[PDB]
Symmetry: D2
Subunit: 308 residues, 4 copies
Amino acid sequence: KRKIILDCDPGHDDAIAIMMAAKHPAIDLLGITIVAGNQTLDKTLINGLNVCQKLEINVPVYAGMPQPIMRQQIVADNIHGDTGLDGPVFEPLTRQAESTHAVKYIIDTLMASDGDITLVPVGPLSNIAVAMRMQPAILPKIREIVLMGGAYGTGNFTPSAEFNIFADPEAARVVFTSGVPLVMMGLDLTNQTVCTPDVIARMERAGGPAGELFSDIMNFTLKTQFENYGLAGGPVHDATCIGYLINPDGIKTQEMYVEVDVNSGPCYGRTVCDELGVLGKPANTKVGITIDTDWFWGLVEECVRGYI
Amino acid sequence: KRKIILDCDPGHDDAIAIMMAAKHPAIDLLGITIVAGNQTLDKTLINGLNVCQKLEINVPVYAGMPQPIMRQQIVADNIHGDTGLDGPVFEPLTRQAESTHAVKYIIDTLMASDGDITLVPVGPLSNIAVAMRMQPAILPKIREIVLMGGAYGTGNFTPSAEFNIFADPEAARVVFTSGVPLVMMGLDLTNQTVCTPDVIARMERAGGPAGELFSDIMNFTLKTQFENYGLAGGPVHDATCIGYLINPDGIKTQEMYVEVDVNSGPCYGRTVCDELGVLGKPANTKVGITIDTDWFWGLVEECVRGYI
Amino acid sequence: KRKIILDCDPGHDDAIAIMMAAKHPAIDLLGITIVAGNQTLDKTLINGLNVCQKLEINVPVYAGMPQPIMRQQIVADNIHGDTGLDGPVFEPLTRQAESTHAVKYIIDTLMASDGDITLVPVGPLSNIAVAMRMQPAILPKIREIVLMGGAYGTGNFTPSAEFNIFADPEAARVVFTSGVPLVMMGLDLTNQTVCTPDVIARMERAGGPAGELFSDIMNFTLKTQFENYGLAGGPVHDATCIGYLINPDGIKTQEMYVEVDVNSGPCYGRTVCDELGVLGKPANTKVGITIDTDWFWGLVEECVRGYI
Amino acid sequence: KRKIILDCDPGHDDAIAIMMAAKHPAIDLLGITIVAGNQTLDKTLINGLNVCQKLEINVPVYAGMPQPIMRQQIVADNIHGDTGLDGPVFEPLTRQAESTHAVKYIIDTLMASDGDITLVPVGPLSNIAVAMRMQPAILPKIREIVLMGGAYGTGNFTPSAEFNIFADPEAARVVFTSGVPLVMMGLDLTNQTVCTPDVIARMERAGGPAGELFSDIMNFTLKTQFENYGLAGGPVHDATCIGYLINPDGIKTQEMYVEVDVNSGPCYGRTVCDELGVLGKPANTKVGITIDTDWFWGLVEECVRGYI
Ligand SMILES: [Ca+2]
Ligand SMILES: [Ca+2]
Ligand SMILES: [Ca+2]
Ligand SMILES: [Ca+2]
């Protein structure tokens, strides 16, 4: 099993990632850490807890950074709605976050570990960067980082930048210069996972708590992702990181030297990816290129069925 | 006919553009202006003159800027050789450049015109930017600018930037903020025109001075373009601008808001292209997307046969 | 009494600041927080504890950030020596740091307070920035921040930047946009406190533990500050913040709009101070202009005598 | 005699510089080149011509760049008025610009020379930068550049930048990296030349065409320089360059390594001056520190009296 800490900002696709991570036998989900991103932390926290309660997921949830490390905070309410998880309606929330701050949880867990834990950040990298600079000794302890973020081609939130990186470019600069093994599921790969109405229907047919939740969630971003970016369905970007850890053969990556641009201006938060190797620098990232969607959606269905 | 001034840094594909522009009846080639780029100006001027002499092109050639407007000069000898036009071997040069500087030629020609002239820049944009800032009254007199440069995806000389723009980002910023009708044949489009051995063979069979010249030229970049960028043949990037003016239906463009990034750093000289229209700014550029290569190679052959 | 938290990177002048803050009856020193700066944290922590043990200061010391929030770490060993506090030799260390992290201490103390605590950063601003972004609710709780850092004219570490800001420009950007009442003792003011041989001799004559310590400390930077910068003596930069809080009439400030430049390049970490108000923006900082050095050295001697 | 070409954007103090340069026997004024700056070129050219006609100065005037090389044009109408030279009255213009563009004039004159000509730029550096990049062979021909621009301390138009540099930072970058001997009369020096009401009265008493002109001109900026920058009189910044060439002993300079910041942001167009030599780079500029104003105003009076 791959031990993971899932760091997220739920978030529609974050919820699908949580659903898969908490169920699949190849993943050992140690804890969920929450960061500000898609919405403010008060909301992404409530959203994370709501998902865990509904799916009866037995994993502690820790609240982290409510703001990025330097920049003026942005949100993605255009895609995710005022709540950050518009669509599903939950019973009154009874579970709460742990007392320990996510940054402390991340540091303490890594330091006490035998170096076998993978971090899976699928929101802005704020928690990760603060942990890395607060306790540099965590670096040798990180097995790998499999993050959803970035784009080698076109961004979403700006032409140059994908949201997670754009929401905290300085934190991304920290992570991308950490020297830790990195896998980047960028938009070039993740936009392939558009969740069209026939995919939603497939998960509805499977049914149960996860099938119902999948439908209520993914129907919302069907509209917003089309209206904003022209996508044929809402991608489940964040779930690709979980897929990658369950079976990396389903995903083609290419090793590249990647740099995060922190210049104010038209490329702030861009992941500059040396696809042709022209800079002659050692690769630092496995960059996602293609995903086998037949495999991927089969895996999603299998996880959904696990909750029946 | 479309009247043009062809501004170039020959340069293998520049030579092919010259060959096409000077021959096709849909183009009225008024003058050739030369800029430093692929090689230093002493070399690109000699290369331009050698090509015109070989093909008996009786169009005046004017020498322009030997250095970019602000940055430290770069060259592309890795692609184009120490001469800037390795491959063909020419007879002793008898023609000479005009005494009028290219910048003065461009300004004077536009100022005296009926507003029907198109600028076709296929090197760094140094001559164009100096002309625009030296005599801003040319702007309302320019019909269109159809330039080869930029990339909405991956660059060549760097991951972020295409060579022409990279060689003078500040000049490019001038041109891209000019407000003049702009067409951009960037690498995304032009990399489709890889001149593979079968395409060279085709032009060899057409024969004559242009067919032989085509072969001697494009066989050289066949090797360097593969070594540097993995390309299956050397693209004839600059010739796409001439093709566009001959028949724009052969090339699909998309209107986009494009900005040139002049920040020192990993995106210096990037053309940032808003493919999805997320910035909510009006388009300023028709950006090349796809080219019909059957049409394009047919047109190249037609022009080649014109010199028989 | 003004309640303070002293955040520092000892550091020769930090030690003088600690000596004054812990002894003057107008200061209520709640706690000392340590940051990486002049040297790595393992060292500035040891230096801070050494000074507290030597002078029998019974204030808790908390260790904070070992690295800046984003940039590559720099140190000032050129000025401060290999240990960070070259000069004095101390008896074996028995004094211990608290187990609580400085960031958590800062946040909890502020949150539990009645808004009457002043922060006094005299190192890089890493601890402060992390606290502000980790718990934004601390902002209304901060009475004032009186920091040593920046320069409106010439920097030290670079022509543009003073060391504390240069060592963490991104953290400084956080602090200077916080909206909290701000006082900046910059180099323009603090270079006025050159500790010349006659000043040292004055403190030697006062004697006792603090007088010996002052001599052993300030004799070191006497040499390093002259060799590296213009300086006739080592300034006691950080002690000016303590002086300011004891009697602000001893220092002339001017209210200015101040911005921290985070651009890579020749002004990275510059504090841009709008001396003439040309930007038309509301002031956010009281910037130090002149200090009454007779008043100041008198105050130092008084504090030194307090340890006899 | 020192042969000069005076490149300017008249401009109140430019006019005083022209008056001195054309009269003092220590200067051989070859030509006046005009650039856009204080106002658009149409206005600065008329202003320059008006001054020459009024004072019967028989020196050719050449019109140059009407826009900076890259940035969006700014003007200083707040200081110089809508005309760029509000204050004096002129008879109908009979004088006109020469037919040769200033950039060509500068190049041709330098290339034909024995290397003994000094350039005296007292506006934005647009003409100079275009000349340097258009014909790099001019570099060794330039004896010295004595420019009015920059500031090692506080700017005027912004806190970071002096107007001439700010109006074309990219051109200034070109000039400051040229390797030509450079003297920089920056604001730190030139602000010492405030033309208070008693100085104006002194020149009125001298009388003649130049005394009357001096008064009409300097009474205008007396008002604007006070309102904008709090200055006690309008400085005659540009005239200090002519003073420097008449008797350099009247001015104290310090050799420094100077870099022009071309970063967009709060230091765009700053001259970063390494006062303390901390960068370990060889000096490239003699930076003005102080001027003997008793000497200087005596020289101004002597020049004024020359026109009686
Ligand atoms: Ca997410
Ligand atoms: Ca070319
Ligand atoms: Ca300190
Ligand atoms: Ca001027």
